[PDB]
Symmetry: none
Subunit: 73 residues, 10 copies
């Protein structure tokens, strides 16, 4: 038996921009209240219990190239 | 038996823009209240229990190229 | 038996930008209150119990290239 | 039996930018209060119980290239 | 049996920028209060119980290249 | 000529209450924007140009007794 | 000519209450923006140009008795 | 000519209360922005240009008795 | 001509209270920004240009008795 | 001509209270910014240009009795 594996790939993921400019982000923070008692997390958990977290995530240039190469015998 | 595998691919994922400009984001934060007692998470969970989280996610250039290459025998 | 493995890949992940500019981020911090009693975390947990954490995450140039190369016999 | 393994890869992850500029980050810190009693962490936990931690994370140039190379017999 | 292992990789992770500029970070520190009684950490924990820690993390040039090379027999 | 003036008045303005209780006031603040150019106030003005002002005005006991006594010759 | 003036008045303005209780006031502050250029106030003005001012005005006992006594010749 | 003036008045302005209790006031401060150029105040002005001022004005006992006694010849 | 003036007045302005209690005032300070150029105040002005000033004004006992006694010839 | 003036007044302004208690005042200071150029005050002005000044003004016993006695010929 012979296995063969030659995954080839070219790509120019381009991101041009002249000038973003005057971005603004002016929130009035509201209010949150959680009321739990118990939980039991296990085995690859992520979570958020109450969060007033505003973001400004301005990258000049945003691109993500993902290639999950896999194989099994 | 012979297996063969040559996945080829070209692509220019282009993103041109002159100027984004004067973006604005002016929220008045409202209000949240959760009332639970218990939970039991397990095995690859993600979650959000209460969240007042505003976002500005302005990338000059947004593109994601994804190729899940897989194979099995 | 023969196994073969030649995953080749070229890519120019480009991120051009002239000038981001005058970004602003002017939040009025709201309010949070959590009320739990107990939890029991285990085995690869991450979490956030109450968070008023604003962000400015401005990179000139944002790109992430990810390739999970794997194989099994 | 023969195993073979030649994962090749070129990539120029480029990040050009002229001038970021006058970034601003003017938060009014709100308020948080957590009220727990107990927890029992174990086995690869991370967490945050109450956090008013604002960030400015401005890198000129942001890119992360990740390749988890793996194999098993 | 023969095992073979030649993971090759070139990449220029580039980060050009002309001038970041006049960054500002003017927070008004809010308030936090946590009220726990007990916990029992164990086996690779990290945590944060109450934190008002603002950050300015401006690197001219931000890039991280990560390659977890692994193999097993 | 004779003028006479004897305005007499009794009154018990009563306000009994046992227990008000658990009043709540949980608003999510909306948003306002005014855009004027000019005005010219004069001679006993009061006003409000833009106001997000919530109130809780709970008096145990609310009564106002008003008697404008006047006369002229 | 004779003028006479005997304005008499009794009143018990009563305000009984047992127990107000657990009042709450949990607003999420919204947002305001005014944009004027000019004004010219004069002669007994009061005003408010933009105000996010929440109130809790809980008096045990609220009563105001007003008597504008006047006369003219 | 004779003028006479005997304004008499009794009043017990009563304010009883047993126990106010557990008042709370938990605002999430929003946001304001005013943009004027000029004004010209004169002759008994009061004003407020932009104000995020929360209040708790809890008096045990709130009553104001006002009597503007006046006369003219 | 004869003028006469005997304004008499009794009043017990009462303010009883047993126990106020556990008052709380937990604001998350928002944000303000004013932008003027000029003004010209004159002749009995008061004002406030920008103010984030929270208050707790808890008097056990709040009452104000006001009597503007006046007369003219 | 005869003028007469006998303004008499009794009043017990009472303020009883048993015990105020555990008052709290936990603000998260927000943020302010004013931007003027010029002003010209004159003739009995008071003012406030920018102020983040929180208060706790708890008197056991709050009452003010005011009587502006005046007369003119």
């Amino acid at each position: 038996v012979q296995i063969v594996y030659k995954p080839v790939d070219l790509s120019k993921v381009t991101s041009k921009c002249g000038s973003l400019g005057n971005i603004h982000h002016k929130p009035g923070g509201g209010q949150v209240e959680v009321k739990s008692e118990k939980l039991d997390f296990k085995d690859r958990v992520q979570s958020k219990i109450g969060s007033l977290d505003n973001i400004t995530h301005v990258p000049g240039g945003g691109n993500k190239k993902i290639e999950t190469h896999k194989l099994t015998f």
